[PDB]
């Protein structure tokens, strides 16, 4: 009919959603968790020092075995490291040196990456020839690839610079489902423990929940005031944290449909680059733009410790599947492990 | 305490040597970033010098060049402009004829104003503090022909001078250079694009050589 009525209905729906979220807010998390003992100080030291890359590292991901981890840098080469021996398993020379995202399949057979180039290059690590070759080139995106994660052994979902997301099939190499709910550049992407849901953050200061089978937006959060740089799913699959430039992390829940609490400090004025949860979820490690990484309590929201092993902006952060250690990457061209 | 990991360590050392060699070969080539409003100017510059990121390799006087064109991206630069922090110099292209022509969705905005704003934003960026800029003023003959009838005061009301080429050219050069704030750290290399070839490449080579000299002198503390 007319745009006036549509905008009025949208505003009414937003007001109704806000009223529902306000009414659902019975109690807070800080007041209840006050009866829990504090985690105290945690002292983590650099157990290993990886000095293979020669450029700024931007992304990394742990494998299912909790021993192998892939890393991407601006030099245009991917390196598979052995955490126990720091050995280089394979060196994948990338055709595009502007890589800023990488993924490690759960089966340990294929690895993906991307960046300014809209084409996502897939690589197989268990070829009979013994040399890593390009498995398939997934093209079709308009903006730069920000994050990618292997949904399964044959399916992969990635986010592009544009305000859309797509799910690719390695068998055919076509967009099985295209999401068009975001209104800004997508920067983060994380899969849920059940593999049926996944969350993604964009520069529109909001985080939305998507469904793989349904292919529609399940929920939308608007607790942040700036762009979201990272997102991680809670181990239980009912919550997820997000990092933004406003230096105020916010935890959300899929069942409450709102922000539980926030993590921030006065001296902390720099933005967040990466966020990850421990195996139990009690510790929330987040890497900032500063040369240090802080550890936050998921329940008490206190600085349990700080990591001053790097001398440059922290770019990525990933905890092992077994929670035995955590690796932190930075633009200093080094990748260290903490525990 | 090693039985079979000896071959693994040997492979690791070989891979490290290969990566170090590739890095020594990678850093051996000069890297440049191509920016500027308008696609015709950048296209003409790339043609004279010979989708996503567009990669181009061309050697001149035994010096390698890696031209980076991000005009086809069309996205918020705030989240990926920092990737070019290590570039040597940024080539900014702007057509002088734009002083009169405007974009489609202008709403009382001149294309020259948008070009100047983009130049100021890219110059005063925190990631390009020590990165030089090479400004090329394209469409020389077209601009010289338009100024014969269309005056320059249409875009710059404060301009008070003769509607000639030399005066207007110098005024535009000053206006583009005035946008620079780091007069001590920055160094803008301005040049008027010519129709004949083998001229812009020479200026680019000279500017790259000067920037390399200045960088090597600053790294030692003598500049």
């Amino acid at each position: 009919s007319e745009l006036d009525q549509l905008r009025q209905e949208a505003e009414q729906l937003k007001n109704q959603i806000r009223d529902a979220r306000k009414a659902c807010a019975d109690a807070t998390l800080s007041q209840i968790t006050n009866n829990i003992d504090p985690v105290g100080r945690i002292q983590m030291r650099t157990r290993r020092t990886l000095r293979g890359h020669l450029a700024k590292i931007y992304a990394m991901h742990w494998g299912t075995d909790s021993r192998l981890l892939v890393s991407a840098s601006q030099d245009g080469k991917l390196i598979i490291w052995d955490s126990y021996t720091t050995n280089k398993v394979h060196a994948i020379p990338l055709r595009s040196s502007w890589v800023m995202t990488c993924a490690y399949a759960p089966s340990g057979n294929y690895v993906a990456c991307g960046g300014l180039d809209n084409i996502c290059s897939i690589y197989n690590l268990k070829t009979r020839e013994g040399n890593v070759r390009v498995s398939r080139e997934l093209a079709g995106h308009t903006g730069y690839l920000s994050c990618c994660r292997f949904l399964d052994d044959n399916q992969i979902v990635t986010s592009s610079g544009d305000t859309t997301c797509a799910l690719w099939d390695i068998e055919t190499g076509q967009q099985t489902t295209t999401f068009t709910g975001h209104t800004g550049d997508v920067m983060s992407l994380s899969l849920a423990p059940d593999t049926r849901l996944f969350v993604s953050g964009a520069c529109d200061a909001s985080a939305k929940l998507w469904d793989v089978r349904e292919g529609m937006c399940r929920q939308t959060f608007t607790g942040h005031e700036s762009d979201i740089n990272a997102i991680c799913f809670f181990p239980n699959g009912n919550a997820f944290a997000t990092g933004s430039d406003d230096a105020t992390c916010r935890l959300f829940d899929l069942r409450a449909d709102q922000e539980l609490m926030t993590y921030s400090h006065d001296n902390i004025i720099c933005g967040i680059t990466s966020v990850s949860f421990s195996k139990s979820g009690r510790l929330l490690l987040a890497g900032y733009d500063d040369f240090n990484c802080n550890v936050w309590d998921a329940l008490k929201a206190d600085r349990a410790g700080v990591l001053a092993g790097h001398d440059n902006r922290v770019s990525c952060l990933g905890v092992t599947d077994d929670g035995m250690a955590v690796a932190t990457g930075s633009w200093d061209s080094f990748l260290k492990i903490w525990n | 305490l090693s039985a079979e990991d000896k071959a693994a360590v040997e492979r690791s050392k070989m891979i490290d040597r290969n990566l170090r060699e590739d890095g020594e070969k990678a850093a051996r080539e000069v890297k440049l970033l191509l920016l500027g409003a308008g696609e015709s100017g950048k296209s003409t510059i790339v043609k004279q010098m010979k989708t996503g990121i567009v990669e181009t390799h061309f050697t001149f006087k035994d010096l390698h060049f890696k031209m980076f064109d991000v005009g086809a991206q069309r996205s918020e630069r705030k989240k990926w402009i920092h990737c070019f922090e290590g570039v040597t110099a940024i080539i900014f292209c702007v057509a002088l004829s734009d002083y009169d022509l405007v974009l489609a969705e202008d709403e009382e905005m001149n294309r020259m104003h948008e070009s100047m704003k983009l130049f100021d934003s890219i110059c005063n960026n925190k990631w390009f503090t020590d990165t030089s800029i090479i400004l090329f003023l394209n469409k020389k003959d077209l601009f010289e022909e338009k100024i014969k009838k269309s005056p320059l005061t249409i875009c710059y009301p404060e301009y008070a001078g003769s509607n000639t080429y030399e005066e207007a050219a110098a005024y535009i050069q000053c206006q583009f250079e005035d946008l620079n704030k780091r007069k001590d750290t920055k160094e803008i290399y301005t040049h008027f694009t010519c129709s004949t070839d083998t001229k812009n490449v020479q200026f680019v080579f000279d500017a790259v050589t000067d920037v390399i000299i200045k960088n090597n002198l600053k790294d030692c503390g003598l500049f």
């Epitope: 394979h90 013994g130 040399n131 | 039985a3 079979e4």
Partner: single-chain antibody, 233 residues
């Protein structure tokens, strides 16, 4: 993936021969090469080994210093120069590739081999309980062996590799480290071990299993193969 070996034939005592093998289908530079000798009335036997970077070249005691191995990276051809060949060296030689990394499967591909006929201590000892056992299709069989030293290394890995040599074909890797099966091997094969004693269980035996099963240890460079267990239908 194919390895065409050449340079066999007859040779008089004390002579010299240069065995050549051209690699194709894979990166010859990245893979290391192994020479496995097998006499007409004996089992497999390790000869020499060369790494990818042509470094750390080790030879066996029986051929220590007498033979030498070389390779050509740009040519992708393996060379084995033998001098002062003895009568005891009369046997067929096999060429095997190997790549070492976390999760690798060394000794996965075995070449054809060329027959070489000569005209007229402290190493790991592998001993098998039985050399020949009768088998029938559809039944389940097990092969057991023993080692003079515990192969279980401090890192938890056990350097034990099993091979099967069918009549008229080269050996094939069945199970490496007793935990991961080689590519293309049916899942009906299973292996176990206790640090010193090892066993190989083959369920649902088929005519394709008729052959001689060999065992190999890789904890020490002086490899040593077992006596070999032959399964007769």
């Amino acid at each position: 993936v194919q390895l065409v070996e050449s340079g066999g034939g007859l040779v008089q005592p004390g002579g010299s021969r240069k065995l050549s093998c051209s690699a194709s289908g894979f990166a010859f530079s990245s893979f290391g090469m192994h020479w496995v000798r097998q006499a007409p009335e004996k089992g497999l036997e390790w000869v020499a080994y060369i790494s990818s970077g042509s470094g750390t070249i080790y030879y066996a005691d029986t051929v220590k210093g007498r033979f030498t191995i070389s390779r050509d990276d740009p040519k992708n051809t393996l060379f084995l120069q033998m001098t002062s060949l003895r009568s005891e060296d009369t046997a067929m030689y096999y060429c095997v590739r190997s790549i070492y990394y976390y999760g690798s499967s060394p000794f996965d591909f075995w070449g054809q081999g060329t027959t070489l006929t000569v005209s007229a201590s402290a190493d790991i000892v592998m001993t098998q309980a039985t050399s020949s056992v009768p088998v029938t299709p559809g039944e389940s069989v097990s092969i057991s062996c023993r080692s003079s030293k515990s192969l279980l290394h401090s890192n938890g890995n056990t350097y034990l590799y099993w091979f099967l040599q069918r009549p008229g074909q080269s050996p094939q890797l069945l199970i490496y480290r007793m935990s991961n099966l080689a590519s293309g091997v049916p899942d009906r094969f299973s292996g176990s071990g206790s640090g010193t004693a090892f066993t190989l269980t083959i369920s649902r035996l088929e005519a394709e299993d008729v052959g001689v099963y060999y065992c190999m240890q890789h904890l020490e460079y002086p490899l040593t193969f077992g006596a070999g267990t032959k399964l007769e239908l």
